[PDB]
Amino acid sequence: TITYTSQVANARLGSFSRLLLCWRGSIYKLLYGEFLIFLLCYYIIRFIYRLALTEEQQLMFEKLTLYCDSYIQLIPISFVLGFYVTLVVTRWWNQYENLPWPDRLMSLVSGFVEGKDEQGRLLRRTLIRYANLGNVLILRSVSTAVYKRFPSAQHLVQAGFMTPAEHKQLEKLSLPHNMFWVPWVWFANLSMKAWLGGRIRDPILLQSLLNEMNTLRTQCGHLYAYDWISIPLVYTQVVTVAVYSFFLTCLVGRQFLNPAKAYPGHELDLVVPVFTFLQFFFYVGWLKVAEQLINPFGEDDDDFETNWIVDRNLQVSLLAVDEMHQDLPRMEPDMYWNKPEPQPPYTAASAQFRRASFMGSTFNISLNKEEMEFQP
Amino acid sequence: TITYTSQVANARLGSFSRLLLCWRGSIYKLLYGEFLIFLLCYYIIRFIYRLALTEEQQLMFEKLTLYCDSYIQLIPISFVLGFYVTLVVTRWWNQYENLPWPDRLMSLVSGFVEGKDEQGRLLRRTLIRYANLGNVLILRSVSTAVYKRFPSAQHLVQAGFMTPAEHKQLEKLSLPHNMFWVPWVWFANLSMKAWLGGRIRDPILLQSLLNEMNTLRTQCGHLYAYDWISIPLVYTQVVTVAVYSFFLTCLVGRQFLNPAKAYPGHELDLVVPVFTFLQFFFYVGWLKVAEQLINPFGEDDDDFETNWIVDRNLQVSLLAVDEMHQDLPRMEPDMYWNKPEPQPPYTAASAQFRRASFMGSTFNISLNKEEMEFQP
Amino acid sequence: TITYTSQVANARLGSFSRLLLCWRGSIYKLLYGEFLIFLLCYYIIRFIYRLALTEEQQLMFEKLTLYCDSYIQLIPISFVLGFYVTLVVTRWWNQYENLPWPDRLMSLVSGFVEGKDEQGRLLRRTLIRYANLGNVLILRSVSTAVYKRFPSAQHLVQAGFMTPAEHKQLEKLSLPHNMFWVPWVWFANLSMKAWLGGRIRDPILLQSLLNEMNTLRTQCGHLYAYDWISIPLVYTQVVTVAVYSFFLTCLVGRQFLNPAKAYPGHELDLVVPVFTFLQFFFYVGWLKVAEQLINPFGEDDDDFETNWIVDRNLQVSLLAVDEMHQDLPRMEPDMYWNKPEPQPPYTAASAQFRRASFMGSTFNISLNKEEMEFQP
Amino acid sequence: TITYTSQVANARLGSFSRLLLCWRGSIYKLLYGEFLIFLLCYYIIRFIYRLALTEEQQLMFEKLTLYCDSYIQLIPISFVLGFYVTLVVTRWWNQYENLPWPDRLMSLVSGFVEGKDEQGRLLRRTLIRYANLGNVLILRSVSTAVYKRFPSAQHLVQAGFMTPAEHKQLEKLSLPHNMFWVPWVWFANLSMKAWLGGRIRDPILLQSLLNEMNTLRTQCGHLYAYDWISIPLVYTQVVTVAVYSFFLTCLVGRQFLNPAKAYPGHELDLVVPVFTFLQFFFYVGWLKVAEQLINPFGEDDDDFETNWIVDRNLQVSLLAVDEMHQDLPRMEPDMYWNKPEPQPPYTAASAQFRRASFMGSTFNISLNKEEMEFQP
Amino acid sequence: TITYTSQVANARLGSFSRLLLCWRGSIYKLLYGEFLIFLLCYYIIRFIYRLALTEEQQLMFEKLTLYCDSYIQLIPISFVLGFYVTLVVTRWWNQYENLPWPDRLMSLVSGFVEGKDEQGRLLRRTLIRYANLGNVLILRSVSTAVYKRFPSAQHLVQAGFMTPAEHKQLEKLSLPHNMFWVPWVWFANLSMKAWLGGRIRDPILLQSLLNEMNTLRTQCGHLYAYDWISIPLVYTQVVTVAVYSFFLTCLVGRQFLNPAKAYPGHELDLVVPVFTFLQFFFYVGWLKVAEQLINPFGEDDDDFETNWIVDRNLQVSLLAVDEMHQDLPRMEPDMYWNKPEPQPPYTAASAQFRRASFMGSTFNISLNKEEMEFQP
Ligand SMILES: Nc1ccc(C(=O)O)cc1
Ligand SMILES: Nc1ccc(C(=O)O)cc1
Ligand SMILES: Nc1ccc(C(=O)O)cc1
Ligand SMILES: [Ca+2]
Ligand SMILES: [Ca+2]
Ligand SMILES: [Ca+2]
Ligand SMILES: [Ca+2]
Ligand SMILES: [Ca+2]
Ligand SMILES: [Cl-]
Ligand SMILES: [Cl-]
């Protein structure tokens, strides 16, 4: 993930222009190879036309180049690229929204599951570990970085996501499908056992724990669905064919003919087709947005940092359910204990952001005495 | 479903270009028949014009070709295709999102319904089987593959989805409507009976079971609605006529006229209209995206694997509620039992994915000592 | 509703082309009258230009046609039509999604409201009848077909939706507004009475019943809102003016001028303006899609079958709460009672749809032994 | 709100054309002033060229007219108008969806809060009045019509929305912000007092009341947010400048020059620029859609009827919680008491709408006897 | 945030035109710097071309200008800008929808947590302060204005958001991640302690408190996600390059050449390019919409007022849970105590907004006596 939120906080002078000096997760990094191949092909065709072809062959090539210009339309390529990239970006954000975070669940497990003894600690840690294990199982199923980190369930055991007993149970339960759903059934059964054992005081609390767990299950299922149900290959092939056909036509149609024969639009002979290269940049970059975002769990620069999320979730969830259980700061009266209207101070840097309240769009309407009188 | 998520994990050199060498669920497989018909017609009209028309007839045909070529831009094919295909793809993903998964319900039935005896096993299996029966009834109503697998309720009985008693009860209840809603009423009544019999310990647990079941009912109803309420036929007819009229005009307008007559743009006879064929691939493939996705429960390569989903749901749900009920792995301290900050290891392959935490876009803002002083 | 889901299950050879031979809910049925008027006007103008106008008047008419030709640009009409039709189609599907189905509520009333005696039957039937009465009240408010079926509350009484006592109570409560909200208050009061009378065993069950009823109330309110708050008339007038101005300009601008004068673009005098008629088909059909979908509760072929929904809901809901209450099929061990991995059979027709499970996109990543050891 | 749903129920002959004969909430009413100003400016420019300008001045004006007409196309009025109006219409419907309706809350207050004595009546009326008071406070904050009806809190007291005691309490609580949130805290505290006093029998019922009230609070907060967070002024200024620049250029570029000079496009003199006026109608009406819909709580014809909603909500809510509490119609066996398959009658007008049930898209699939055998 | 809702309440004569005389959050303020740089470059190129350039160099420059002006339209600028700005605006409103408001939570804490003594006051204030502390932690993580106000946790302690005990506890719990999640775990533990201590009377009330808090946690997580996961840098770079390439081409292609040469399109020389400047305003303003809205938590004029929200939330939440707990206005019969149909009065200014109720689109449908008869 390339984060530039801080750089674009304000709409300053050339805010977006300063982002063109970035290499990591940039357009240049994405399309330099394709641009070099296109450049080599274009200049090979140019040299063949200018040196190898005879006069009659040169005239035939010039007619072919003039005929190619009529089939280069930007409206269809722009429309198909716009729709396809919009779908890819929508799916990309939906995929991010389905990354499971244990924060709601870990707050409920910290609160509800009682006991500061070893058994209560073990129960809370086991429940939150089941949540983390389900998340890491689906992530190593869908993310290449996580898979490279945990290429086998034995790696999960060595890393401490799974105990050897849990590994044995998963091997025993093995079916010919992905087994990422198992820790959620384990969580439900352990929560029920905790409630029957008196560690969860009320069934309303048990229902709340299960609702959080089921929300995480739904998120994991969505991740699996996005990994499995790709954007239809016909749509991807259509957009690829559109872009590549456009630039294969541009290889011949955008060749600078002899300025001696003053063909319309060929009176000036540049050596570098600036507009063709700009169009290459725009359209191939638009396609590379989709290329990078179509699977956001790969190892691209702008792909999700799944390994960081896995580590953070484990650390934070274990701290929440183990050391922060019934460990609250001393409850004392605050700064505004007898202040009816608290007014926190502003720093010198932030004094200009002190604003009067917005009281509604109708606040400043002025009416006469006659206009405000109720009628019978 | 053709899955190519693994192939497009990273935006490598020509990432989308390598997908053009795929046959299953590809553009070529979708439109090779239409392309062969178009090619045959194009070369029939070419041979009629060149070998079976007189001079005056040839001149008339050349005028008709110039008129077709000059006015083919009047067909708004890209606009109608874009807006239609976007709607089709939206409905396709919505249809997938309404495929019922019993995973939340199966976890709740595994937890809540108590009893390791025969009566408990039968009760849990019966509830999860009612969920699976409802799902398979709606799927065989809307999916051609599932219908071919279960062309009658007796096939459901032979396949073990439906008990002979359940078949008799469905025949007894028969109304002049689709009976996919019956297993949900059966589930509600059996859950109430289980709660009254003490197998479900608290009514809060019964409410949770029914809320999950009702979610599945809503998903099944959405599937039925999508099957019934098609995309309006007028919209489909409009888009079809746009594409077919474009490529029927192309039959005449894209003919290579006699180079002797020296018509503007017809000086070169290439025999093969390469750009017309590229346009055919692009526009007919764009239509074939909608053609394949308009009913995602058919037998296309990119259609949903409904039979696999049916089999997996049955296997997983029965395992979850029968063998995994109160069958938990041994609960022992994990490897980070007294580690305040766990740090799972990284492999050699994944060492480069270890990242520092994102602490917010404001983390690196630098302020002077005077700028950070509170003002009165 | 014209349903063609079965016809478009697979992307076969000319799948969408076979739908062009449909008359009911087709484009031809929608625009034949407008097409005939446009054709009659076009050919009257053509005959006036060819016969009535003198030489100087013919030259003026030809200048007018050339001047009109520059202003028949399709880029604006496609933009307004696409955005407007997208809004109409979105509202159309949202309107369908707000059709109330009592299936969740009917399952909860069948389960929760106890009693196989006359009083329990009467209570369950009365609750589900209140739900159906609310639905039919809003539908006859918004749907012309339902109104024609029930043009008065006495028709609802004769049809058995409403008892004479309920009719008297509605007359007694009458306010100067639509009274579709009344049965929901009746349902809440009757549910509370049932819970106080011991027919509903727990307040958790009562809360579940009320949540389902309130969901149906929200759906009915959305239906009322869509019926009341039309798409702004200015937007509809704008899109209508765009299309009609385009095809009124086409009456003069798309006249075939005398080919003798060799005007640019008028060299060939086809009698029938094939491209103008295709443009008419596309743009007026796109507008007719909106015209038919703008109120989906009328009597168009593609409008919703509200009367069928009313009848089905009543039949199903009454059967669910009356005959199917505590009427469960015999609960016996299933076909896979001691089968750890059930495998339902495939028919000969469906054997090709058996697939191996998708195990995740990272399953087939290969790593070396050196890549797979954890680093400290 | 202009409702034309009844007029557009069916796709009749020129359904949308008959809406061009509407004045209230029409395009004509919205842009007649701007059209008159544009007409006055255009003909005044024409007169100055035809009468005040000398020969060399006329030639300079003709060059300017040829120049402006060529680059009027450079303004992409259609794309920016389409996107901006789509955003405005989206926000308009979202704003409507956040108009609070107390129907779910009023059903729960009617059911749950017990007591047919004076204290129960007073408690129910007070709770529903707090809901209505919150709604009217936010509406008079955001709606000009409601503000004109209630220009002060004393007007709310005179109109009976607020008791003098409630007014005194609001004055006592006054903070430098909008106080629309106060009645929700009052509702929560009064509900808690009712539950502690035995008027609400169970805390599950109290939770249901508070969930409904909080939904209304969220809707009111969304209304406040839409009133406060306008569409960014830069976007509105961009679209305004695009449209106005287009039609200021058209003042000069669409002038009918001297026919004698025969400049291409100006060789024929028509005093009325029909196509420029049609373009004015289209583009300025497209902008006027956004102009009217940008604040849907003003006093436009197509703006929301907030005063009607306020009156209806108060009447209906008070009737539901006061007169309709435990006042149910006599519960008697219905018309279909012993009818297994009820079939409500159809009128003569509605007999054609009787349809057979849709049984699924797979219903009519035909298979051979061999195709329906299960294989081992 | 610039609010102009009051200015655009009605679609008056040139309502959007009057907004062009705004400076704060305007197009002028956003792009005056870029416009001055573009002006300086354009007039430097003009002076280089007209003077200090030889005849042959002038001819070369004229050929370059004709080439650039002819091929400038090849840049796709409308399509990419439309799609990108739509994505930015969608994300901007989603970011606003995730700003946490404690109004639901504050009502529940005011109602449920009992006790008018010091301990109850302290418990309520502490819970609502935990909610506010979580909100301000995430906001200072994502908002530059809030960070400038609270550049350290010690500033939060001095401002009264955090007690020194809470600061010590946060320092003790420190992990290498953002610690905005801590107050939610504190809230859950303190709520559980309150329920065990009898301050919360029922576990259903505790579940309602935790559901509200978890909703606020989800909103904070969404804010963090939007701050972290920027719009892909490749997409931003593509759009920036499109706009800047367009106007760098316009620097040369939109030069007014020597009128002596009488180029087709340069016959009129105006020193100021009005159309190029209009295009600059339109396209660069469209980009500045995205530039300002890409991070809505900066210090732009149209950015969110996060400091105001922080102050208001603290003032309102503390007042709601401390001074307004069980402090209700006197419950007395209202103005309509025995009025079956209340009718609040209208003022003279608002008398025209009194409307009859909309009774449904089918209300005015007329039928014959024969059409209304039920058929057998
Ligand atoms: N004939 C041409 C060849 C190339 C270019 C260009 O894109 O720069 C323009 C015209
Ligand atoms: N001058 C013309 C008139 C009509 C048509 C057409 O639409 O076919 C084409 C050219
Ligand atoms: N040749 C031209 C130079 C500049 C302009 C313009 O004002 O945009 C138009 C034409
Ligand atoms: Ca990727
Ligand atoms: Ca299909
Ligand atoms: Ca209709
Ligand atoms: Ca308005
Ligand atoms: Ca900003
Ligand atoms: Cl070709
Ligand atoms: Cl005109």
Under 8 Å CB-to-CB from D19, ≥6 apart: which residues? C233, C236, C237, C240, D4, D7, D8
| CA of residue C353 to ligand 5 center, whole Å | 14
Distance from C-alpha of D131 to C-alpha of D314, rounded to nearest angstrom = 9
Beta-sheet pairing, C374-375 with B374-375:
unpaired
Give the Å distances, CA to CA, from D9 to A37, D315, E138: 58, 31, 50
Distance from C-alpha of D15 to C-alpha of C31, rounded to nearest angstrom = 11
Give the closest residue to E344 by CA, choosing from D158, B370, C225, A118: D158
Which uninterrupted H or E stretch holds E374? strand E374-375
What DSSP line would sit under B276-329, residue for residue?
Answer: HHHHHHHHHHHHHHHHHHSSTTSS-TTS--HHHHHHHHHHHHHHHHHTSTT---
**Is B300 marked within a binding site?**
yes
In angstroms and rounded to an integer, the radius of gyration of the C-alpha atoms of chain C is 31
Distance from C-alpha of B159 to C-alpha of B157, rounded to nearest angstrom = 5
Distance from C-alpha of B25 to C-alpha of B17, rounded to nearest angstrom = 16
Distance from C-alpha of B246 to C-alpha of D160, rounded to nearest angstrom = 67
Under 8 Å CB-to-CB from B162, ≥6 apart: which residues? B133, B153, B156, B170
Which residues of chain D make contact with A358, given a CB cutoff of 8 A? 178, 228
* A14 Rama class: left (phi>0) / alpha (psi -120 to 50) / beta: left
E46 lines ligand 3 (CB under 6 A): no
Report helix, strand or coil for B365: coil
Question: Which residues is E375 bridged to in the sheet?
Answer: D346
Q: Which two tokens stand for residue A265?
A: 């639009």
| CA of residue A221 to ligand 4 center, whole Å | 20
Under 8 Å CB-to-CB from D50, ≥6 apart: which residues? none
In angstroms and rounded to an integer, the radius of gyration of the C-alpha atoms of chain B is 31
Give the closest residue to A287 by CA, choosing from B308, E349, E238: E238
Q: Kindly give the number of the ligand 1 atom that is closest to the alpha carbon of A270.
A: 8
Phi then psi for residue C358, to 5 deg, are -80, 120
Classify residue B369 by burial, with Cβ atoms within 10 Å: 0-12, 13-18, 19+: exposed
Binding-site residues of E for Ca(2+) sit at 9, 292, 295, 300, 303
| CA of residue A7 to ligand 8 center, whole Å | 10
Instruction: Return the amino acid letter for D180.
Output: F
Neighbours of A173 (CB within 10 A): 19
Q: Which of residues 141-200 of B touch A (CB under 8 A)?
A: none
Phi then psi for residue A375, to 5 deg, are -105, 145
Neighbours of C182 (CB within 10 A): 24
Give the Å distances, CA to CA, from E63 to B271, E262, E275: 37, 13, 21
Q: Which two tokens stand for residue A125?
A: 């840690």
Phi then psi for residue C347, to 5 deg, are -75, 170
Under 8 Å CB-to-CB from E170, ≥6 apart: which residues? E153, E162, E179, E182
Under 8 Å CB-to-CB from B354, ≥6 apart: which residues? A307, B346
Residue E292 in contact with partner chain D when CB distance is under 8 A: yes
Give the ligand with the smallest distance to the CA of E12. 7
Residue D304 Cα to chain centre, angstroms:
6
Do the Cβ atoms of D275 and D256 come closer than 8 Å?
A: no
Do the Cβ atoms of B4 and A211 come closer than 8 Å?
A: no
Nearest CA to ligand 3 atom 3: E254
Of B144, B175, B228, the CB nearest to D362: B144
Q: Which two tokens stand for residue B376?
A: 């009165």
Do the Cβ atoms of E349 and A367 come closer than 8 Å?
A: yes
Q: How was this structure determined?
A: cryo-EM
Of C68, C186, C318, the CB nearest to D336: C318
Give the closest residue to A191 by CA, choosing from A123, A255, A244, A256: A123
DSSP A347: E
Phi then psi for residue C270, to 5 deg, are -70, 140
Instruction: Return the amino acid letter for D88.
Output: V
Q: Which residue has the tokens 């724990």?
A: A209
Distance from C-alpha of A144 to C-alpha of A122, rounded to nearest angstrom = 32
Neighbours of E10 (CB within 10 A): 15
Question: Which residues is D347 bridged to in the sheet?
Answer: E374
Nearest CA to ligand 1 atom 5: A273
Distance from C-alpha of A132 to C-alpha of A106, rounded to nearest angstrom = 10
Give the closest residue to A42 by CA, choosing from A246, A279, A248: A248
Q: CA torsion, points A250, A252, A254, A260, in degrees to nearest 10? A: -170
A235 lines ligand 1 (CB under 6 A): no
D71 lines ligand 3 (CB under 6 A): yes
Give the Å distances, CA to CA, from B289 to A231, A238, A261, A286, B240: 10, 9, 45, 21, 13
Q: Which residue has the tokens 């769009």?
A: A361
Do the Cβ atoms of E111 and D189 come closer than 8 Å?
A: yes
Distance from C-alpha of E278 to C-alpha of C289, rounded to nearest angstrom = 37
Of D357, D358, D362, the CB nearest to B143: D362
C268 lines ligand 2 (CB under 6 A): no
Distance from C-alpha of B225 to C-alpha of D360, rounded to nearest angstrom = 10
Subunits with 3+ C-beta pairs closer than 8 A to D: A, B, C, E
Classify residue B158 by burial, with Cβ atoms within 10 Å: 0-12, 13-18, 19+: middle
First and final C-alpha spacing in chain A: 66
Do the Cβ atoms of C242 and C80 come closer than 8 Å?
A: yes
| CA of residue E170 to ligand 10 center, whole Å | 72
Distance from C-alpha of A289 to C-alpha of E242, rounded to nearest angstrom = 15
Phi then psi for residue E265, to 5 deg, are 130, -10
| CA of residue C319 to ligand 7 center, whole Å | 49
In angstroms, the separation between the Cα of residue C174 and the nearest Cα of chain E is: 10
Distance from C-alpha of E120 to C-alpha of E126, rounded to nearest angstrom = 10
In sign, the C-alpha dihedral spanning C174, C176, C180, C181 is negative
Do the Cβ atoms of D71 and E275 come closer than 8 Å?
A: yes
Give the closest residue to A342 by CA, choosing from E324, E157, E103, E312: E312
Which residues of chain B make contact with E152, given a CB cutoff of 8 A? 372
User: Which of E276, E277, E279 has the most ligand 3 atoms within 8 A of CB, as the residue to mutate?
Assistant: E276
Subunits with 3+ C-beta pairs closer than 8 A to E: A, B, C, D
Instruction: Return the amino acid letter for E39.
Output: L
Which uninterrupted H or E stretch holds E375? strand E374-375
CA angle C180, C184, C187 (to 5 degrees): 140
In angstroms, the separation between the Cα of residue C376 and the nearest Cα of chain A is: 11
Which residues of chain B make contact with E140, given a CB cutoff of 8 A? 360, 362
Give the Å distances, CA to CA, from D151 to A108, A362, A365, D171, D297: 47, 9, 9, 16, 15
Q: Which two tokens stand for residue D279?
A: 């373009």
Distance from C-alpha of C150 to C-alpha of C136, rounded to nearest angstrom = 9
Do the Cβ atoms of E282 and E7 come closer than 8 Å?
A: no
Interface touch E141/B360, C-beta < 8 Å: yes
Residue B312 in contact with partner chain C when CB distance is under 8 A: yes
Give the closest residue to A103 by CA, choosing from E183, B107, B336, B337: E183
Give the closest residue to B172 by CA, choosing from C330, E10, D261, D190: C330
CA angle C53, C57, C58 (to 5 degrees): 70
Distance from C-alpha of E287 to C-alpha of E283, rounded to nearest angstrom = 6
Of D285, D316, D325, the CB nearest to C189: D325
Phi then psi for residue D347, to 5 deg, are -75, 170
Neighbours of C164 (CB within 10 A): 12
Phi then psi for residue E283, to 5 deg, are -70, -45
Give the closest residue to B145 by CA, choosing from C3, C358, D371, A229: D371
Q: Kindly give the number of the ligand 1 atom that is closest to the alpha carbon of A273.
A: 8
Give the closest residue to D62 by CA, choosing from D71, D75, D53: D53
* B26 Rama class: left (phi>0) / alpha (psi -120 to 50) / beta: beta
| CA of residue A275 to ligand 4 center, whole Å | 29
Distance from C-alpha of E201 to C-alpha of E194, rounded to nearest angstrom = 9
Distance from C-alpha of A284 to C-alpha of D220, rounded to nearest angstrom = 46
What DSSP line would sit under D239-288, residue for residue?
Answer: HHHHHHHHHHHHHHHT----GGG--TT-SS--SS-HHHHHHHHHHHHHHH
Q: Which two tokens stand for residue C166?
A: 């309920």
Give the Å distances, CA to CA, from C183 to C215, D208, E19: 14, 19, 49
Distance from C-alpha of E104 to C-alpha of E110, rounded to nearest angstrom = 10
Angle between helices A233-253 and A274-293 in degrees, nearest 10: 170
Interface touch A173/B324, C-beta < 8 Å: yes
Distance from C-alpha of A250 to C-alpha of A253, rounded to nearest angstrom = 5
Under 8 Å CB-to-CB from C122, ≥6 apart: which residues? D331, D332, D333
Q: Which residue has the tokens 């014009």?
A: B49
E276 lines ligand 3 (CB under 6 A): yes
Distance from C-alpha of B122 to C-alpha of B346, rounded to nearest angstrom = 46
Distance from C-alpha of D50 to C-alpha of D54, rounded to nearest angstrom = 9
Which chain D residue has the Cα nearest residue C90?
A: D90
Distance from C-alpha of B229 to C-alpha of A315, rounded to nearest angstrom = 49
Do the Cβ atoms of C87 and C122 come closer than 8 Å?
A: no
Distance from C-alpha of A143 to C-alpha of A150, rounded to nearest angstrom = 10
Q: Which two tokens stand for residue C167?
A: 């009719």
